[PDB]
Design a protein around this ligand. Structure first.
Ligand SMILES: *Cc1cc2c(cc1C)nc1c(=O)[nH]c(=O)nc-1n2C[C@H](O)[C@H](O)[C@H](O)COP(=O)(O)OP(=O)(O)OC[C@H]1O[C@@H](n2cnc3c(N)ncnc32)[C@H](O)[C@@H]1O
Ligand code: HEM
Ligand SMILES: CC(C)Oc1cccc(NC(=O)c2ccccc2I)c1
Ligand code: SF4
Ligand code: F3S
Ligand code: FES
Lengths: 239, 138, 613, 102
C-alpha cells in the first residue's frame, strides 16, 4: 500500500457563497497510473465525480490537461506524480486566469489573440493556388522546426507576469511565437506587414526577457528565442 | 464575429460575473532566471531614484558639494561602517551593470536556452560580488 | 421546462465536428457563400485528428513515378472487397488535388532534394496494381502530420465568417418527417440548451474507440453522432468492423505510428525472429493493418510473448540510423520516453495490438449524403450529411489502409461542402422546426442530471470496456460472442440504474461523460450483435467458427462456368444495424456493396481476389 | 505603417551600450566634457527605464497620462540639476572621486 496526498483547487459556480478552497484526496499509487492525469481520472471515477477538468488525448499533443502542478504549468498526462509520499502534490489552474469551474480556465482571450495574428499562409497572387505544390528547400523547412510543434496549451503565456499584469493588450509567447512561425516561412509573402502589426508598445514590446515561458514548456520549445528573434527583425526590416 | 470582438466579449462577461482569478504569485515556484529579472527592476528603480535625488538636491538645496562632504564627517568616519556605506551603492549598481550586459546579449539572441540562462546567471551573480567588494576598497 | 433556457439559432448549414473532416466541411461551406455554424464539444485544435502521426496519402509522384489508379487498387484490396469502389475512385482521384491544396493552405510538409512533399512507404501499398513492389505516396509532416493538419486547417478557417459553437455537446438530431432540420445541443459553459437549426446538417463526430478498454483513441472519441443517427431511427453501417493498430505502447495504450514500419522498422518476438516474414512472404512487417496485428496477437497465443507477463511484442528501432530517427520520427521519440520510459535509439519499443479505427458509422454516398434503407434500396435522407471516421462511405471497407483517414477527412469533407454548394442555394428557406421539438433530448438531460441510481457512472463504463475487450477482440469466436451479446444487453438496461453526483449547470463533466456513456452503449450493442451475425473472415472481422471468405463466388477458381449465390446467402454485403431505443433490441438489415466505379474507362473495376500479402 | 515602437526599442539599446561605454571612459578620462555626456546618458536611460515601468503597472486612461507627465517633469529636473552640478560645481567625474577616497 502506497497512499499519495493530492491538494486540488476547487470552486463551484452553481453554489451561492462558495469561495475558492482546497480539497484533499488519498490515492494508492499501485492501483493508479504513472501520470498526474491518471490520478485526476481516478478520483473522478472512484472518489469524487464533482471534480471538473479538461482532458482528451492523454498523449501530450492535444493540450487539454494544461494546469499548474507544484508551481509549474505543464501537461498532466506528460508529467508523472512524485513517488515520494512525504510531499503533497498541489494542483492549481493556469495562473492569473478567470476560473470557470475547478481547474478549468477561460481561454477565450487566448484563442482570440491567436486569431489577430492571422495564422495562415498569405500569398500575393492567390489566383494560381490550389493546383500546384509550393517549392520549399530542406534548409527552409528546418527554419520551421522547433516552432510548428506548438500545441497552444497556453502554458508559456500563463507563466509570465507580463501576461498577468497586461493580459488584454499583450499577446504572449504562444501567440507571438506563431506570428514568427509564419514570418520565416518562405512561402509567406506578407512578412513585412506581419511585423507592422506589432508596431505598438503593448503587443510585442511588453516582453522583458523574464524567461518563464520557455522554462515551463511541455514540448521543450523556446518561445523566448523566437520573441527575441522578432525584435531583431523589427529593428531591421525593409520599408 | 471578428478577432477583436471576441476580446471585447471576453472582458464584458468575466467582469460582470463572480468568477475568481486563479492564484499567480501565491503558487508559482521561484526560479533564479525569473528572480534575477525582479532584482534588475529592484536595482533599476532604486538606482534611478539615487540619481534623481542627486540632481534634485543639487538644484533645490543650498551649499556646494565640498561643504556637504564636511557634513558627512560629523559622524566621525567609522572605518568598517563607511566601507558598508559605499558597498550599499556599488552593489545595486554593479549588479545592474553585469546583468544589463546579459540583457544586451539576449537582445542579440545569444544564449537563450534554459541551461545557458542559469550558467550566465551565476556568472553575473558572482561578478556582482567581486566588483562590489573590489570597488569598495579604493 | 422553466429550468432550461431554450435558444433557437438560424443558419444555412450546421457541421457537428471541428476535426479535419468537419472543419474542412465547415469553412468549405463558408467559402462557397453559406452561413455555416460549427457545433463542437471540444476546441477545434483539441480534436483527435491531432493524434495522427503517420501521414496523408497522395499519388503526387515525388519519390518514384506514381499513378492514383495504383492507389485505387491498394485501397480496394485493403478493403477486402467490402469497400465501395465508387467512393474509392472519388477519394484517390481527389487525393493529389486535396494534398496540394493543403500545402498551399500552410501545412509545412517535410521536404526532399527537389523541394517537393516528402512521401514514404506505408502499410500495404504497391506500384503497378500490385506488381511493382512497394509504393511511396504517404505524404508526412515528420511524425506530427495530423497535428500539423488540424492546425493549418483551423488556421485557414479563421479567414471566413464561420460561427463556432465551441464547447457545445450536441445531444440529438432535430428531425421532422424523415428530414434533418438541425441540431439540439448543450452549452457546457452555462448549462443551457441551444437548438441550432438549418437546411443541412453535416456529421463528423469521429469514431467510438472508447467502447473498449485498451484503445489508441482519445477520451472524447465516444461516437456521439453515430448514436444521434441511431436514436433517430436511422441505420448504422458496418459497425462490427473495428481496426486493431499493430503498434502501440503496452502501458497507457498510446500510438507508435506505422511510420516506423516504412522508414525501416522491423518486428521481433521472444526468440528474436522476424515473425512477420513467416506470415507474409514478399510483404514482411509492411503488410495490411489487420494482417500484421493478426500475427502479433497469434504469437501471444503460442506463448511466444515478451516481457514479465509475456503478453506483448517488440518493435525494432535499434538498428535504424540515429540521424533518421530524430528527423523522421521525432513524435514517437518523446512519447515513448515519457509513457514507456524506453530509449528510442538504444532500445526496442514494447508494442501490442490495440483498438484504433472504426470502419463503420453512418451510411454515406460518394458525395457525402446520408443513406437510409427502405425496401432493400438506397434512399437519401434530406438535409443530412456525414464525413470522416464517424461516417461509413465504406471507402475503407472491411480494413482501412494505412494513412487513408486524413485523406478520407479532406476529400469527403470537401464533398459534403460541394453537395450543399452545387445543389441547393444559400438564403433558401430554413425549414421550420416544431415549437415543441427536442423534448426527449431535454428530458434525457434532466434524467441524467438528478440521477439517484445504484451503479456509479464509471463503474458501468468499466463493465462495458472490459466486456468488449474480451468478447470482441482481434480473434472472436461465436461461443464467446453469444455471451458478449447478452452481457452488453443487460448493461443497456442498467442505464437507468446509474448515479450522478454533480448536479450543476456550468461545466458538468459528470453529466456529459454519462451522456457519452449512453452514446457509447448504442455503439457497443450494434458492434457486438453485428459481429456474432456475420459468419466469415473478411478484413478486420475474423471468425474462428467461419474462417472462409464468403463472397458471391469461390474466387479461388475462375468464374465462367460457376453459378451465382443468392444475396441472403453470401456475406459480401453491408451490415445495416438498427436498435430500439427503449428495449435495446438490435435488428439488422443488409445492402449490396457498390462495385461499379465513377467511370469504367478512366478507372477499372477491381474484381474480388485472394486477399493475402 | 510607421515604425515608431521599433525605433524606441533600439534607442534604449543605443544608450545602453553608450552608458556602458562611458563608465570606464569616466574613470580613465575624467573631464568636463565627460561630465555632460555621462549626465545626458544617465538621465535618458532612466527616463525610458521608468517609462517601461509605468506602461507595465500603471492601469487606466487617466492615470498613465498623469504618470508620464509626472515622470517627464521629474526627468527634466534631474537633467537640469546635473548640468548645473557640472557647470557651477565640481562635476560628477571629480565629485565621485572626492567621495571615493573618504
Ligand atoms: C486514434 C488515432 C487515430 C489516427 C491516428 C492516431 C491515433 C492515435 N493517426 C492517423 C494518421 O496518422 N493518419 C490518418 O490518416 N489517420 C490517423 N488516425 C485516424 C484519424 O485521426 C481519425 O479517424 C480522424 O482524425 C477523425 O476525425 P474527425 O474530425 O471526423 O473526428 P475527431 O477527430 O474525433 O473530432 C471529433 C469532433 O466532433 C466534435 N464532437 C464530438 N461529439 C460532439 C458532441 N457531443 N457535440 C458537439 N460536438 C461533438 C468534437 O468537438 C470534435 O472536434
Ligand atoms: C552601464 C551599466 C548599465 C547597463 C548595461 C544597463 C542596461 C539596462 C538595460 C538593457 C535595461 C532594460 C532591460 C530589459 O531588456 O528589459 C535596463 C533597465 C533599467 N535601467 Fe539600466 N543599465 C545600466 C545602468 C543604469 C543606471 C546607472 C541606471 C540609473 C540611472 C539605470 C536605470 C535603469 C532603469 C530605471 C531600468 C528599468 C527597465 C526595466 O528593468 O524594465 N541603468 N538597464
Ligand atoms: C511569481 C512572482 C515571483 O512573479 C512576479 C511577481 C511580481 C512581479 C514580477 N516581475 C515582473 O512583473 C517584472 C520584472 C521585471 C521586468 C518586467 C516585469 I512585468 C514577477
Ligand atoms: S509554446 Fe510550448 S508552452 Fe507555449 S502554448 Fe506552445 S506548446 Fe504550450
Ligand atoms: S514576458 Fe515573455 S515571452 Fe517569455 S520573456 Fe517573459 S515570458
Ligand atoms: S490531455 Fe492531451 S495533452 Fe494532456
Amino acid at each position: 500500500p502506497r497512499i499519495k496526498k493530492f491538494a486540488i483547487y476547487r470552486w463551484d459556480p452553481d453554489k451561492t457563497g462558495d469561495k475558492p478552497h482546497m480539497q484533499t484526496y488519498e490515492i494508492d499509487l499501485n492501483n493508479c497510473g504513472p501520470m498526474v492525469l491518471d490520478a485526476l481520472i481516478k478520483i473522478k471515477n472512484e472518489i469524487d465525480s464533482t471534480l471538473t477538468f479538461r482532458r482528451s488525448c492523454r498523449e501530450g499533443i492535444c493540450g487539454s490537461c494544461a494546469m499548474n502542478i507544484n508551481g509549474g504549468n505543464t501537461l498532466a498526462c506528460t508529467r508523472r506524480i512524485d513517488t515520494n509520499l512525504d510531499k503533497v502534490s498541489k494542483i492549481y489552474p493556469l495562473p492569473h486566469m478567470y476560473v470557470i469551474k475547478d481547474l478549468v480556465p477561460d481561454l477565450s482571450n487566448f484563442y482570440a489573440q491567436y486569431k489577430s495574428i492571422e495564422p495562415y499562409l498569405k500569398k500575393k497572387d492567390e489566383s494560381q493556388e490550389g493546383k500546384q505544390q509550393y517549392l520549399q528547400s530542406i534548409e527552409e523547412r528546418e527554419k520551421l522546426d522547433g516552432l510548428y510543434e506548438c500545441i497552444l496549451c497556453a502554458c508559456c503565456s500563463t507563466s509570465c507576469p507580463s501576461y498577468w499584469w497586461n493580459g488584454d493588450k499583450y499577446l504572449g509567447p504562444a501567440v507571438l511565437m506563431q506570428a514568427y512561425r509564419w514570418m520565416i516561412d518562405s512561402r509567406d509573402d506578407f512578412t513585412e506587414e506581419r511585423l507592422a502589426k506589432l508596431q505598438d508598445p503593448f503587443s510585442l514590446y511588453r516582453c522583458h526577457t523574464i524567461m518563464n515561458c520557455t522554462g515551463t514548456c511541455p514540448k521543450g520549445l523556446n518561445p523566448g528565442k523566437a520573441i527575441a528573434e522578432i525584435k531583431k527583425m523589427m529593428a531591421t526590416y525593409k520599408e | 464575429t471578428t478577432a477583436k470582438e471576441e476580446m471585447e466579449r471576453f472582458w464584458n462577461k468575466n467582469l460582470g460575473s463572480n468568477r475568481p482569478l486563479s492564484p499567480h504569485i501565491t503558487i508559482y515556484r521561484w526560479s533564479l532566471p525569473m528572480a534575477m529579472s525582479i532584482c534588475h527592476r529592484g536595482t533599476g528603480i532604486a538606482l534611478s531614484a539615487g540619481v534623481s535625488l542627486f540632481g534634485l538636491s543639487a538644484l533645490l538645496l543650498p551649499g556646494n558639494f565640498e561643504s556637504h562632504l564636511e557634513l558627512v564627517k560629523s559622524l566621525c568616519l567609522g572605518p568598517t561602517l563607511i566601507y558598508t556605506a559605499k558597498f550599499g551603492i556599488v552593489f545595486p549598481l554593479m549588479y545592474h551593470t553585469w546583468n544589463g550586459i546579459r540583457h544586451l546579449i539576449w537582445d542579440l539572441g545569444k544564449g537563450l536556452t534554459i541551461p545557458q540562462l542559469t550558467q550566465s546567471g551565476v556568472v553575473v551573480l558572482i561578478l556582482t560580488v567581486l566588483s562590489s567588494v573590489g570597488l569598495a576598497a579604493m | 421546462s422553466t429550468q432550461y433556457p431554450v435558444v433557437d439559432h438560424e443558419f444555412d448549414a450546421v457541421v457537428v465536428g471541428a476535426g479535419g473532416a468537419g472543419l474542412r466541411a465547415a469553412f468549405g461551406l463558408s467559402e462557397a457563400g453559406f452561413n455555416t455554424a460549427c457545433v463542437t464539444k471540444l476546441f477545434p485544435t483539441r480534436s483527435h485528428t491531432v493524434a495522427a502521426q503517420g501521414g496523408i496519402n497522395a499519388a503526387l509522384g515525388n519519390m518514384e513515378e506514381d499513378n492514383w489508379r495504383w492507389h485505387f487498387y491498394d485501397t480496394v484490396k485493403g478493403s477486402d472487397w467490402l469497400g465501395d469502389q465508387d467512393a474509392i475512385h472519388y477519394m484517390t482521384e481527389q487525393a493529389p488535388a486535396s494534398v496540394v491544396e493543403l500545402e498551399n493552405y500552410g501545412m509545412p510538409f517535410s521536404r526532399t532534394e527537389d523541394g517537393k512533399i516528402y512521401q514514404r512507404a506505408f502499410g500495404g501499398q504497391s506500384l503497378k496494381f500490385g506488381k511493382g513492389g512497394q509504393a511511396h505516396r504517404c505524404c508526412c509532416v515528420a511524425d506530427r502530420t495530423g497535428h500539423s493538419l488540424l492546425h493549418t486547417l483551423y488556421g485557414r478557417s479563421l479567414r471566413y465568417d464561420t460561427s463556432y459553437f465551441v464547447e457545445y455537446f450536441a445531444l440529438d438530431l432535430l428531425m421532422e418527417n424523415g428530414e434533418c432540420r438541425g441540431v439540439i445541443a448543450l452549452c457546457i459553459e452555462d448549462g443551457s440548451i441551444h437548438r441550432i437549426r438549418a437546411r443541412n446538417t453535416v456529421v463528423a463526430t469521429g469514431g467510438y474507440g472508447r467502447t473498449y478498454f485498451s484503445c489508441t483513441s482519445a477520451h472524447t472519441s465516444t461516437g456521439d453522432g453515430t448514436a444521434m443517427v441511431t436514436r433517430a431511427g436511422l441505420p448504422c453501417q458496418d459497425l462490427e468492423f473495428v481496426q486493431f493498430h499493430p503498434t502501440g505502447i503496452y502501458g497507457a495504450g498510446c500510438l507508435i505510428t506505422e511510420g516506423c514500419r516504412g522508414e525501416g522498422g522491423i518486428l521481433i518476438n521472444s526468440q528474436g525472429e522476424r515473425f512477420m516474414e513467416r506470415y507474409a512472404p514478399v510483404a514482411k512487417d509492411l503488410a495490411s493493418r489487420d494482417v500484421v496485428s493478426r500475427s502479433m496477437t497469434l504469437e501471444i497465443r503460442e506463448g511466444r510473448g515478451c516481457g514479465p507477463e509475456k503478453d506483448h511484442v517488440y518493435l525494432q528501432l535499434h538498428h535504424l540510423p540515429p540521424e533518421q530517427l530524430a528527423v523522421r520520427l521525432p513524435g514517437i521519440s518523446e512519447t515513448a520516453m515519457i509513457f514507456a520510459g524506453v530509449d528510442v535509439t538504444k532500445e526496442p519499443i514494447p508494442v501490442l495490438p490495440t483498438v484504433h479505427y472504426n470502419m463503420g458509422g453512418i451510411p454515406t454516398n460518394y458525395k457525402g449524403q446520408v443513406l437510409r434503407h427502405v425496401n432493400g434500396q438506397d434512399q437519401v435522407v434530406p438535409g443530412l450529411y456525414a464525413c470522416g471516421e464517424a461516417a461509413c462511405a465504406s471507402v475503407h471497407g472491411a480494413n482501412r489502409l494505412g494513412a487513408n483517414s486524413l485523406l478520407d477527412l479532406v476529400v469527403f469533407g470537401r464533398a459534403c461542402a460541394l453537395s450543399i454548394a452545387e445543389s441547393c442555394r444559400p438564403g433558401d428557406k430554413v425549414p421550420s422546426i416544431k415549437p415543441n421539438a427536442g423534448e426527449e433530448s431535454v428530458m434525457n438531460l434532466d434524467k441524467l442530471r438528478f440521477a439517484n441510481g445504484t451503479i456509479r457512472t464509471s463503474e458501468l463504463r468499466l463493465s462495458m470496456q472490459k466486456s468488449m475487450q474480451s468478447h470482441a477482440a482481434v480473434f472472436r469466436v461465436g461461443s464467446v460472442l453469444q455471451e458478449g451479446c447478452e452481457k452488453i444487453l443487460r448493461l443497456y438496461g442498467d442505464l437507468q440504474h446509474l448515479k450522478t453526483f454533480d448536479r450543476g449547470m456550468v461545466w458538468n463533466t459528470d453529466l456529459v461523460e454519462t451522456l457519452e456513456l449512453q452514446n457509447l452503449m448504442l455503439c457497443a450493442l450494434q458492434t457486438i450483435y453485428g459481429a456474432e451475425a456475420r459468419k466469415e473472415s473478411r478484413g478486420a472481422h475474423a471468425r474462428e467458427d467461419f474462417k472462409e471468405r464468403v463472397d458471391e463466388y469461390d474466387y479461388s477458381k475462375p468464374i465462367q462456368g460457376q453459378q451465382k449465390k443468392p444475396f441472403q446467402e453470401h456475406w459480401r454485403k453491408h451490415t445495416l444495424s438498427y436498435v430500439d431505443v427503449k428495449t435495446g433490441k438490435v435488428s439488422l438489415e443488409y445492402r449490396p456493396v457498390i462495385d461499379k466505379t465513377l467511370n469504367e474507362a478512366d478507372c477499372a473495376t477491381v474484381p474480388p481476389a485472394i486477399r493475402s500479402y | 505603417s510607421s515604425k515608431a515602437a521599433s525605433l524606441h526599442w533600439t534607442g534604449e539599446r543605443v544608450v545602453s551600450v553608450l552608458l556602458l561605454g562611458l563608465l570606464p571612459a569616466a574613470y580613465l578620462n575624467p573631464c568636463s566634457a565627460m561630465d555632460y555626456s555621462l549626465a545626458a546618458a544617465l538621465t535618458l536611460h532612466g527616463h525610458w527605464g521608468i517609462g517601461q515601468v509605468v506602461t507595465d503597472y500603471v492601469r487606466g486612461d487617466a492615470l498613465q497620462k498623469a504618470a508620464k507627465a509626472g515622470l517627464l517633469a521629474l526627468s527634466a529636473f534631474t537633467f537640469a540639476g546635473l548640468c548645473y552640478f557640472n557647470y557651477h560645481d565640481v562635476g560628477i567625474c571629480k565629485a565621485v572621486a572626492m567621495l571615493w577616497k573618504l
